[PDB]
Design a protein around this motif. Structure first.
Motif, PDB file in Angstrom:
ATOM      1  N   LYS A  76       0.343  -6.080 107.047  1.00 31.29           N
ATOM      2  CA  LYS A  76       0.365  -4.904 107.911  1.00 31.29           C
ATOM      3  C   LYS A  76       1.777  -4.503 108.331  1.00 31.29           C
ATOM      4  CE  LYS A  76      -2.316  -5.764 111.332  1.00 31.29           C
ATOM      5  NZ  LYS A  76      -3.379  -4.726 111.373  1.00 31.29           N
ATOM      6  N   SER A 117      -7.721 -12.475 108.905  1.00 19.06           N
ATOM      7  CA  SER A 117      -7.033 -11.408 109.611  1.00 19.06           C
ATOM      8  C   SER A 117      -6.595 -10.337 108.624  1.00 19.06           C
ATOM      9  CB  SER A 117      -5.808 -11.940 110.370  1.00 19.06           C
ATOM     10  OG  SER A 117      -6.182 -12.932 111.309  1.00 19.06           O
ATOM     11  N   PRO A 118      -6.442  -9.096 109.079  1.00 20.26           N
ATOM     12  CA  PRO A 118      -5.927  -8.046 108.194  1.00 20.26           C
ATOM     13  C   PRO A 118      -4.596  -8.458 107.582  1.00 20.26           C
ATOM     14  CG  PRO A 118      -6.887  -7.035 110.120  1.00 20.26           C
ATOM     15  CD  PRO A 118      -7.027  -8.535 110.312  1.00 20.26           C
ATOM     16  N   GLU A 136      -5.546  -2.006 109.810  1.00 21.61           N
ATOM     17  CA  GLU A 136      -6.478  -3.045 110.235  1.00 21.61           C
ATOM     18  C   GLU A 136      -7.721  -2.983 109.360  1.00 21.61           C
ATOM     19  OE1 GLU A 136      -7.578  -3.027 114.390  1.00 21.61           O
ATOM     20  OE2 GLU A 136      -9.371  -4.229 113.988  1.00 21.61           O
TER      21      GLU A 136
END
Lengths: 209, 52
Positions: free
Chosen positions: A203, A199-200, A191
């Motif tokens: 992931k 947004s990250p 994150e």
């Protein structure tokens, strides 16, 4: 004798006025305060001596002021070559003591950001990377996620320097875990906060290629 | 010889003034600290005079 500088890092656009502060634990004798400019990876260059007198060949955009405890180095308008580190030294008493230094960095628009390995796991330990790229505001990569759990002390961050014609670039984050922990889990989430983004990114870290 | 028409000065008046300035508090400490990394430096005394 202590002489601490302020602030740690200065963010200013080119051509703006820069003000760097250097304070002292006690009064500096005879106002014997010097300012040096140091480029990345070379010897410091003397800018100011006597807290107000500028050295030979130094452009008049550099000036010094102050007395007693508090001294100030001012750059009237920053050139591209001026975004380097600056040190303050006192020599009115023994021993002569320097400051921690202040970094002047180019301010710009907010950012533009552009699983485990086999051999390593076979070789035992493994290291998962969380990499980024051209970004400005100095906050890149924050937290890891091993099966929805945070960890501390097993990851190392390492950032780069500001770019030449875009003033950007990014940080590398390496999470190190032995073979007993790389194969014990199957996800390595991450994150990021304030990448100049929404947004990250990316992931997904399923164990395997 | 017209030497009797000459005036009367004080030869070391300026030097004695610098000696008296040197006895003020912190003057010797200023000189000692200035001559720490070199054998020759310029020091500004409490009365505003810069002396080698």
């Amino acid at each position: 004798e202590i002489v601490t500088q302020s602030p740690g890092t200065l963010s200013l656009s080119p051509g703006e006025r820069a003000t760097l502060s250097c304070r002292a634990s006690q009064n500096v004798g005879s106002n014997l305060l010097a300012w040096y400019q140091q480029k990345p990876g070379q010897a410091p260059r003397l800018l100011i001596y006597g807290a107000s007198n500028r050295a030979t060949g130094i452009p008049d955009r550099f000036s010094g002021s102050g007395s007693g405890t508090d001294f100030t180095l001012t750059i009237s308008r920053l050139e591209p070559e001026d975004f380097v580190v600056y040190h303050c030294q006192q020599y009115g008493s023994s021993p002569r003591t320097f400051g921690q230094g202040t970094k002047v960095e180019i301010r710009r628009t907010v950012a533009a950001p552009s699983p485990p390995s086999d051999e390593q796991l076979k070789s035992g330990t493994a290291s998962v990377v969380c990499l980024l790229n051209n970004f400005y505001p100095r906050e890149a990569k924050v937290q890891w996620k091993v099966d929805n759990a945070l960890q501390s002390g097993n990851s190392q961050e390492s950032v780069t320097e500001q770019d030449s014609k875009d003033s950007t670039y990014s940080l590398s984050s390496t999470l190190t875990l032995s073979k007993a922990d790389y194969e014990k889990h199957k996800v390595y989430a991450c994150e990021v906060t304030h990448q100049g983004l929404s947004s990250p990114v990316t992931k997904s870290f399923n164990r395997g290629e | 010889f017209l030497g009797f028409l000459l005036g009367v000065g004080s030869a070391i008046a300026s030097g004695v003034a610098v000696c008296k300035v040197l006895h003020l508090e912190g003057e010797v400490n200023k000189i000692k600290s200035a001559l720490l990394s070199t054998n020759k430096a310029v020091v500004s005394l409490s009365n505003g005079v810069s002396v080698l």
